[PDB]
């Protein structure tokens, strides 16, 4: 039944004028990670 008294968004975002190749590669990295582990993390949804 416990819950964190506060829940902030996951990323500690960083404002910048970054290079154009960083954000797309990070998005592809997140896409790769999500499509694989979430189907296997489904059983923990009940407790989450």
């Amino acid at each position: 039944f416990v819950m964190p008294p506060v829940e902030a968004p996951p990323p500690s975002l960083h404002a910048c004028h970054p290079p154009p190749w960083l954000a797309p590669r990070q998005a592809a990295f997140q896409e790769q990670l999500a499509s694989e582990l979430w189907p296997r993390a489904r059983p923990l949804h009940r407790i989450v």
Binding site: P19, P20, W21, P24, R25, A28, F29, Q32, L33, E36
Partner: protein
Amino acid sequence: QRIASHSHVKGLGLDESGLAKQAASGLVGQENAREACGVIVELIKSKKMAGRAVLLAGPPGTGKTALALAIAQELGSKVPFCPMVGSEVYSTEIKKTEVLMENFRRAIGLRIKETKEVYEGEVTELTPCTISHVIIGLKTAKGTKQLKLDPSIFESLQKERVEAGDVIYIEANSGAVKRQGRCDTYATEFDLEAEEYVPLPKGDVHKKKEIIQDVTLHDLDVANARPQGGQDILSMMGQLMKPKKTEITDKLRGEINKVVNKYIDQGIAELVPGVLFVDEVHMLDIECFTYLHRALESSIAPIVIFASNRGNCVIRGTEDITSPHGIPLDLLDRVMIIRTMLYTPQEMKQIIKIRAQTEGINISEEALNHLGEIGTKTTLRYSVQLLTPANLLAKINGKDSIEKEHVEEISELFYDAKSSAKILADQQ
């Protein structure tokens, strides 16, 4: 440019015959110690002797670290130099033995001439020919060129989402396609759009140029320590850290040495021995010494310089064994010891004048004389500190130079070590 404590020291200052002068390079006095330093500096340039050590012994403030920095400077930049403090060995993440091991593999440099080539320009068209190959047209200010682009890297091409209009890099060796952004002439196509719009390259699309940059052997070891890729969950390597994790002697460094020897035999690589420097060796543990006095006996260990800033004292880790210089007699042998002695009023005055004319402060004669005389009462490392605030007060008073009324008045605002000890004898 951020004048440092040893920025004025630019070399040992020996003559063509190997004798020590009162050279303008930044060192005065210490004739015998500077001669020994210049004699050992030839060992480094000889590139034939490995597994050596030199102990700079002497009272504090006598300039042993200055001698080490002069040795480092005289060599130049081609050979690496890795200054390390003895206290740094005590890492709470990884054992000290492997820390010292890696430290020993960092001095050894490695020069290699890579005649690589990359292709840059606005990508004009992609025509993927089960892909047999993909033709890519790169445009630059000097013309356009079409390249058959190894369909195996079409994966990366799509990963970058690059298409007609973008400016990109590509490395001929591995296919390191890098999207710089959209072309300049395509800007404003949408009056509001999050893009970079990098200028169009001006040089020849075919960019073949040699890179003679050097890398360290420890860098190679680290690059070969952990794997790469996110096959299934191995993506975890872009996350939780990799602090100086321990390599293994039996299967990594041996193969590294084998492959490096192979490449050197082919005439591609070029080895350049470095110089390691350990400050305040007395801080190391007795086990660090027991490992060091046997690891430096190998055939690959680079020449090292030991600096002990104290005399006969108990070695750390035993609390009941006294040895000269805080180094055990077992390890104190095999090490050429160079004594560093105290200076004279004249030498202290010369050092102070050098520091002054290096920092950029002009000082009168009567002022410099008493500033150096203070170097006799106090340590040499106190007049150097007092010199700056004197000029600061002078400039505050309009006077651009340092008169005797400033150096003798600023010595009152700050106290030296001995005066503080005298006052602090009350335990508060």
